[PDB]
Design a protein around this motif. Sequence first.
Motif, PDB file in Angstrom:
ATOM      1  N   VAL A 238      -5.758  10.417  -3.529  1.00  0.00           N
ATOM      2  CA  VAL A 238      -5.910  11.052  -4.826  1.00  0.00           C
ATOM      3  C   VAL A 238      -5.312  10.092  -5.844  1.00  0.00           C
ATOM      4  O   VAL A 238      -4.097  10.070  -6.054  1.00  0.00           O
ATOM      5  CB  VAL A 238      -5.244  12.426  -4.868  1.00  0.00           C
ATOM      6  CG1 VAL A 238      -5.484  13.079  -6.213  1.00  0.00           C
ATOM      7  CG2 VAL A 238      -5.783  13.295  -3.751  1.00  0.00           C
ATOM      8  N   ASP A 239      -6.171   9.261  -6.436  1.00  0.00           N
ATOM      9  CA  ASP A 239      -5.777   8.444  -7.574  1.00  0.00           C
ATOM     10  C   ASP A 239      -5.361   9.370  -8.696  1.00  0.00           C
ATOM     11  O   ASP A 239      -6.203  10.057  -9.272  1.00  0.00           O
ATOM     12  CB  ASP A 239      -6.914   7.539  -8.046  1.00  0.00           C
ATOM     13  CG  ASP A 239      -6.576   6.812  -9.339  1.00  0.00           C
ATOM     14  OD1 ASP A 239      -5.828   5.815  -9.286  1.00  0.00           O
ATOM     15  OD2 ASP A 239      -7.040   7.244 -10.413  1.00  0.00           O
ATOM     16  N   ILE A 240      -4.063   9.389  -8.993  1.00  0.00           N
ATOM     17  CA  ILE A 240      -3.485  10.363  -9.904  1.00  0.00           C
ATOM     18  C   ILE A 240      -3.980  10.163 -11.330  1.00  0.00           C
ATOM     19  O   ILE A 240      -4.050  11.119 -12.108  1.00  0.00           O
ATOM     20  CB  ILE A 240      -1.949  10.272  -9.777  1.00  0.00           C
ATOM     21  CG1 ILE A 240      -1.431   8.884 -10.160  1.00  0.00           C
ATOM     22  CG2 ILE A 240      -1.492  10.737  -8.396  1.00  0.00           C
ATOM     23  CD1 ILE A 240       0.055   8.821 -10.255  1.00  0.00           C
ATOM     24  N   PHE A 241      -4.395   8.954 -11.671  1.00  0.00           N
ATOM     25  CA  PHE A 241      -5.012   8.695 -12.955  1.00  0.00           C
ATOM     26  C   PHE A 241      -6.464   9.125 -12.993  1.00  0.00           C
ATOM     27  O   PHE A 241      -7.052   9.148 -14.075  1.00  0.00           O
ATOM     28  CB  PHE A 241      -4.879   7.216 -13.283  1.00  0.00           C
ATOM     29  CG  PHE A 241      -3.586   6.644 -12.827  1.00  0.00           C
ATOM     30  CD1 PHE A 241      -2.411   6.986 -13.467  1.00  0.00           C
ATOM     31  CD2 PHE A 241      -3.530   5.807 -11.728  1.00  0.00           C
ATOM     32  CE1 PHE A 241      -1.208   6.481 -13.041  1.00  0.00           C
ATOM     33  CE2 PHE A 241      -2.328   5.300 -11.296  1.00  0.00           C
ATOM     34  CZ  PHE A 241      -1.165   5.637 -11.956  1.00  0.00           C
TER      35      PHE A 241
ATOM     36  N   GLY B 119      -9.062   7.652 -12.303  1.00  0.00           N
ATOM     37  CA  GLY B 119      -9.883   6.638 -12.915  1.00  0.00           C
ATOM     38  C   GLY B 119      -9.506   6.252 -14.326  1.00  0.00           C
ATOM     39  O   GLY B 119     -10.374   5.770 -15.059  1.00  0.00           O
ATOM     40  N   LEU B 120      -8.256   6.457 -14.745  1.00  0.00           N
ATOM     41  CA  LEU B 120      -7.863   5.984 -16.070  1.00  0.00           C
ATOM     42  C   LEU B 120      -7.737   4.468 -16.100  1.00  0.00           C
ATOM     43  O   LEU B 120      -8.319   3.803 -16.962  1.00  0.00           O
ATOM     44  CB  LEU B 120      -6.560   6.634 -16.525  1.00  0.00           C
ATOM     45  CG  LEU B 120      -6.642   8.059 -17.065  1.00  0.00           C
ATOM     46  CD1 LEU B 120      -5.256   8.604 -17.324  1.00  0.00           C
ATOM     47  CD2 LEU B 120      -7.477   8.103 -18.325  1.00  0.00           C
ATOM     48  N   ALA B 121      -6.994   3.900 -15.163  1.00  0.00           N
ATOM     49  CA  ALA B 121      -6.781   2.462 -15.149  1.00  0.00           C
ATOM     50  C   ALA B 121      -7.044   1.896 -13.773  1.00  0.00           C
ATOM     51  O   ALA B 121      -6.268   1.093 -13.249  1.00  0.00           O
ATOM     52  CB  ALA B 121      -5.371   2.113 -15.605  1.00  0.00           C
ATOM     53  N   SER B 122      -8.146   2.306 -13.164  1.00  0.00           N
ATOM     54  CA  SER B 122      -8.529   1.814 -11.853  1.00  0.00           C
ATOM     55  C   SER B 122      -9.994   1.427 -11.885  1.00  0.00           C
ATOM     56  O   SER B 122     -10.832   2.187 -12.379  1.00  0.00           O
ATOM     57  CB  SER B 122      -8.269   2.863 -10.773  1.00  0.00           C
ATOM     58  OG  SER B 122      -8.600   4.156 -11.238  1.00  0.00           O
ATOM     59  N   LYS B 123     -10.297   0.252 -11.354  1.00  0.00           N
ATOM     60  CA  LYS B 123     -11.660  -0.245 -11.348  1.00  0.00           C
ATOM     61  C   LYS B 123     -12.486   0.415 -10.250  1.00  0.00           C
ATOM     62  O   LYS B 123     -12.018   1.318  -9.560  1.00  0.00           O
ATOM     63  CB  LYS B 123     -11.662  -1.762 -11.176  1.00  0.00           C
ATOM     64  CG  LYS B 123     -10.913  -2.500 -12.274  1.00  0.00           C
ATOM     65  CD  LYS B 123     -10.679  -3.954 -11.911  1.00  0.00           C
ATOM     66  CE  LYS B 123      -9.846  -4.047 -10.652  1.00  0.00           C
ATOM     67  NZ  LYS B 123      -9.828  -5.399 -10.033  1.00  0.00           N
TER      68      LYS B 123
ATOM     69  N   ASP C  92       0.838  -1.181   0.000  1.00  0.00           N
ATOM     70  CA  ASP C  92       0.000   0.000   0.000  1.00  0.00           C
ATOM     71  C   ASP C  92       0.878   1.237   0.000  1.00  0.00           C
ATOM     72  O   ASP C  92       1.912   1.274   0.662  1.00  0.00           O
ATOM     73  CB  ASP C  92      -0.925   0.013   1.213  1.00  0.00           C
ATOM     74  CG  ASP C  92      -1.603   1.354   1.417  1.00  0.00           C
ATOM     75  OD1 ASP C  92      -2.109   1.930   0.431  1.00  0.00           O
ATOM     76  OD2 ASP C  92      -1.637   1.833   2.566  1.00  0.00           O
ATOM     77  N   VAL C  93       0.484   2.232  -0.787  1.00  0.00           N
ATOM     78  CA  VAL C  93       0.982   3.595  -0.644  1.00  0.00           C
ATOM     79  C   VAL C  93      -0.224   4.469  -0.314  1.00  0.00           C
ATOM     80  O   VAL C  93      -1.218   4.507  -1.044  1.00  0.00           O
ATOM     81  CB  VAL C  93       1.739   4.096  -1.880  1.00  0.00           C
ATOM     82  CG1 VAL C  93       1.005   3.781  -3.177  1.00  0.00           C
ATOM     83  CG2 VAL C  93       1.951   5.579  -1.774  1.00  0.00           C
ATOM     84  N   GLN C  94      -0.169   5.138   0.825  1.00  0.00           N
ATOM     85  CA  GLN C  94      -1.247   6.052   1.140  1.00  0.00           C
ATOM     86  C   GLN C  94      -0.853   7.432   0.657  1.00  0.00           C
ATOM     87  O   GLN C  94      -0.597   8.333   1.461  1.00  0.00           O
ATOM     88  CB  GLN C  94      -1.559   6.050   2.633  1.00  0.00           C
ATOM     89  CG  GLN C  94      -3.023   6.216   2.943  1.00  0.00           C
ATOM     90  CD  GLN C  94      -3.878   5.157   2.284  1.00  0.00           C
ATOM     91  OE1 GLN C  94      -3.558   3.970   2.321  1.00  0.00           O
ATOM     92  NE2 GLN C  94      -4.971   5.584   1.668  1.00  0.00           N
ATOM     93  N   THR C  95      -0.764   7.585  -0.656  1.00  0.00           N
ATOM     94  CA  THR C  95      -0.645   8.909  -1.231  1.00  0.00           C
ATOM     95  C   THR C  95      -1.918   9.700  -0.970  1.00  0.00           C
ATOM     96  O   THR C  95      -3.031   9.238  -1.238  1.00  0.00           O
ATOM     97  CB  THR C  95      -0.332   8.813  -2.722  1.00  0.00           C
ATOM     98  OG1 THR C  95      -0.425  10.112  -3.318  1.00  0.00           O
ATOM     99  CG2 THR C  95      -1.224   7.798  -3.441  1.00  0.00           C
TER     100      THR C  95
END
Lengths: 48, 52, 47, 158, 459, 48
Positions: free
Chosen positions: C38-41, C43-47, C27-30
């Motif tokens: 903050v999913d940096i994508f 939602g580009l490649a995350s389900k 895990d990285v808790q960015t």
Amino acid sequence: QLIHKDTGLIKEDEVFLGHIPLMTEDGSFIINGADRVIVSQIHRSPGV
Amino acid sequence: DVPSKIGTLLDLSATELEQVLYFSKYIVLDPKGAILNGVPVEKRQLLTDEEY
Amino acid sequence: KGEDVPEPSVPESFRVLVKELQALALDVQTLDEKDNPVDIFEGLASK
Amino acid sequence: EKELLEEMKHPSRARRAKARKRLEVVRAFLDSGNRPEWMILEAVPVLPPDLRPMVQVDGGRFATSDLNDLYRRLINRNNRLKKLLAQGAPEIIIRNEKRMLQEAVDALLDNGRRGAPVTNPGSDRPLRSLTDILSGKQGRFRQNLLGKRVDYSGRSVI
Amino acid sequence: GDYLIHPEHGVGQYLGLETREVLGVKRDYLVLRYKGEGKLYLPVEQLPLLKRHLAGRLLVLQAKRKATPGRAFPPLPEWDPLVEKGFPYELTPDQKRALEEVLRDLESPHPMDRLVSGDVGFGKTEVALRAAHRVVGHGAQVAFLVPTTLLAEQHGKTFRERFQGLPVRVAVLSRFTPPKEEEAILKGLAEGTVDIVIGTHRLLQEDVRFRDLGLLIVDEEHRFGVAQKERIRELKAEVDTLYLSATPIPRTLYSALVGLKDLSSIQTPPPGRKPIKTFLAPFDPLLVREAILFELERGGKVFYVHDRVASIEARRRFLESLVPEARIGVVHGQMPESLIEETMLLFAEGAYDVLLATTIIEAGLDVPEANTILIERADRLGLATLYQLRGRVGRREEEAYAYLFHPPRLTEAAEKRLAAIADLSDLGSGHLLAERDMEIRGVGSLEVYTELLEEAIRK
Amino acid sequence: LSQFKDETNPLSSLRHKRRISALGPGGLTRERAGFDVRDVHRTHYGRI
DNA sequence: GGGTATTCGCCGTAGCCCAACCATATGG
DNA sequence: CCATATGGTTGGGCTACGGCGAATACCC
């Protein structure tokens, strides 16, 4: 010289043993067309 | 890495996890009221597989 | 086109760090300072 | 951790230090809230192929990412174990194959720490591990984040 | 100064005598120079060991054979029924579909170019039988090649069984055929009084004549021979040929069989021709003890193979040191064949227990009770032999166990080769696709193909 | 010691031939290199 | 046992070998 | 006259230093 110790099977046989590069007339070495050179090494002499 | 976390907490060495992970020694997970040949069995104790 | 450059957002080098970290299955808790992952994508490649 | 504290009350400063270290570990896992059961691996990830680019050179050869052939070895290991468990094999082969699969994981994570670095056969420089992708000068930190080349640059003499 | 008929080193030249130095001893020697100056000076005491004295021709030819169709064999709706009623047994609808498919190709005037992987089942000569009775339905002859004399024997046996009350003249010609009868059969197929000729290399070597060369049955041609394929091409002056080469050439021509040769294999192995329990592994003798214990529990028979130059017998003696219980022989060949058949009936009588065989040719029978097989040098082998071993172990409904012993893991191409051997269960086209992968690894031009094909039409 | 032969001028070739060294497999390293392998002994006089 | 340097260690720094097959040689 | 042994032909397959550390015995 094949010299069997017990038999005395005597077979003299010259063998080709590789292609040894020849130092040129000036003293260089053409290797793969390219020219090599060897710098002579010093180190401590053997002995006591 | 030194120390090993399994060797830290479950108190063993790399040889011991070598034996249990790569199948050289049994380690007891339930003593089951058995005996370790006179001395009794106690959990977290190594054991060879045939003797197991 | 003859304009100023845009400004790069979350670093893609840092993105590939996150990717290899999850390739080591960690895990990285960015986050921001208030704990939004903050999913940096975005939602580009995350389900 | 209570009996570790009891060892802290015990005068043996050596065992105090050892129990202290283990107490640091268990305290870190407690405040972390991590589950130490997660240290055993079942859900192996998958690297995206842009991160492991097997792109081809002109002369047939590739950008052979060593972890890709390691992945192939792991797939053969997993499917060999799957078909071995799928037939009711004798246990010794099962045990040996499970051990070998464990070796496959061990070499994939970092080759050569347990035993020798299994290289490519027909080669002796090893298979560059994911840790080698991370650690080292050519590893991610020093290479890919501290020194680079640059476009829009020039060089001449003064 | 004299020549020599020298026994053990070829051409010799007596050039006088040499009194030479053993280290302290002046023994006498003979000045002898040989082939490429074999300058041996043997001790003269060994007096009795001495007495005083490319393909482009065939490429363009088969290209023209492509460019020239030839004759058709019309379906003959009595000839194939005459044989077809005689088979008192079911045929595979896959194989029957392929049968009438290649019969339709016989009805084509084109040269019949077919391969079928019809290996083991309800009579695998049966398609060749009915095609042959079409071929002799016009009276044309049926050449029939073979890898070995025993298979030739068995197939001519089945032909005779099929043609007891059917006048299709079969005849065997190879090494074991008697010589008067050999040229009798040569004259007879030369006279057309023989319709089917049978045999191995001798058929290609013996000077044959055809009244009407209608059929040429070739089979498993990889072990018959690629130069033997060229000798077939020499015996192929624009004729129509049958290929049951289920085990093909290693892609020196097999990818060329894609496209022009009709790839008409059958699939769906019988569910009841069940696989054998494959165990690829390193070597350990205790697993051997367990396996032979299972085989004596069922009272079965044991297969273990040895292919190394090393002593089969002292290896067997080591086994008997481990296992004094069973009774093991040595079926290394280079033996009188009385010993071979005596071992066959000793494992029939079964007091002998472990067949220490050394070839799949020497394992050329499927003993039913042999329900285990032990292989240690499968890295130094080839795949056709491998699943022929698999097809030679275990009777049906007896769940045999295949044990494969490879401690060295250092031959990566052969390593994944054995992996893609042991993954396969049974004959569900893994024959085909495993050969595909193998010969992909084995070898690894349409430009010059159709180019010189055009100028062959110009001829 | 298998060095590229240099021919920038005849003097370059000559000096490259007359060059001598103290390193090599069996020479020394730069790591533990002190000054004894760097200074000039008095016995070098007229010698090197 | 608590504590002392210690002392050296470890880490870091390109070859046959048989498998069929064939003709070639030979004693009852 | 036949047989068994010879050998010939592909076939197919493969091989010494440094910093820290770690037992290492050691003072009261």
